[PDB]
Amino acid sequence: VTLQLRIDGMHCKSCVLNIEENIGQLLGVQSIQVSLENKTAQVKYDPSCTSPVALQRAIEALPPGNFKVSLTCSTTLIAIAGMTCASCVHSIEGMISQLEGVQQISVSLAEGTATVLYNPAVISPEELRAAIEDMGFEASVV
């Protein structure tokens, strides 16, 4: 995740260099970005080890107080060859959800693919395909 802050002393520009060198190699910060035309610094951080206040208190003590900041189940994937508009999603996700064993179903045109949580006692993947073929389209199990 991304955050924005202001700094005192970055007016001299070179202040940002010794910050940039140290910030981005650390357990909770993976890269650094600058926005000096906006007047801010832009940090690219991991919320697992750190947070806005913890970052603030870390980076402000890099210098000697010299640069100050202000802040029953299986899952399978399907490929489909009868999707011509986004309305195909609300049609497939709707109609295929009605034939039992289908616990959860999601579909996208971006790759032409669905992901579905099925009951392996009640239904098999090759039956999922057959239902889209019965709807009037074509499906394939990946």
Side-chain angles (χ1 to χ4, degrees), residues 23 35 79 108 134:
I23 302 309
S35 197
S108 171
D134 193 33

Side-chain angles (χ1 to χ4, degrees), residues 2-7 10 16 19 23 32-44 59 69-71:
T2 314
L3 89 50
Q4 203 82 237
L5 55 81
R6 284 290 288 270
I7 310 185
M10 77 137 82
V16 88
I19 307 174
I23 302 309
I32 187 59
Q33 166 158 91
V34 294
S35 197
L36 306 182
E37 54 176 64
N38 186 93
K39 286 64 168 177
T40 48
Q42 188 82 107
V43 76
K44 294 162 157 195
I59 79 171
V69 305
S70 307
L71 277 279

Side-chain angles (χ1 to χ4, degrees), residues 88-99 102 105 131 135:
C88 296
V89 171
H90 82 74
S91 308
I92 292 167
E93 202 197 72
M95 295 296 298
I96 308 306
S97 188
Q98 304 187 18
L99 51 51
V102 55
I105 179 175
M135 201 177 179

Side-chain angles (χ1 to χ4, degrees), residues 2 5-6 9 15 17 19 21-22 31 33 41 43 49 52 55 59 73 75 93 100 106 119-120 128-129 132 135 137:
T2 314
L5 55 81
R6 284 290 288 270
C15 155
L17 182 290
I19 307 174
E21 193 168 79
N22 285 282
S31 45
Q33 166 158 91
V43 76
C49 303
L55 289 175
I59 79 171
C73 60
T75 328
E93 202 197 72
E100 298 133 278
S106 175
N119 172 319
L128 303 174
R129 162 172 168 168
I132 287 80
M135 201 177 179
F137 305 116

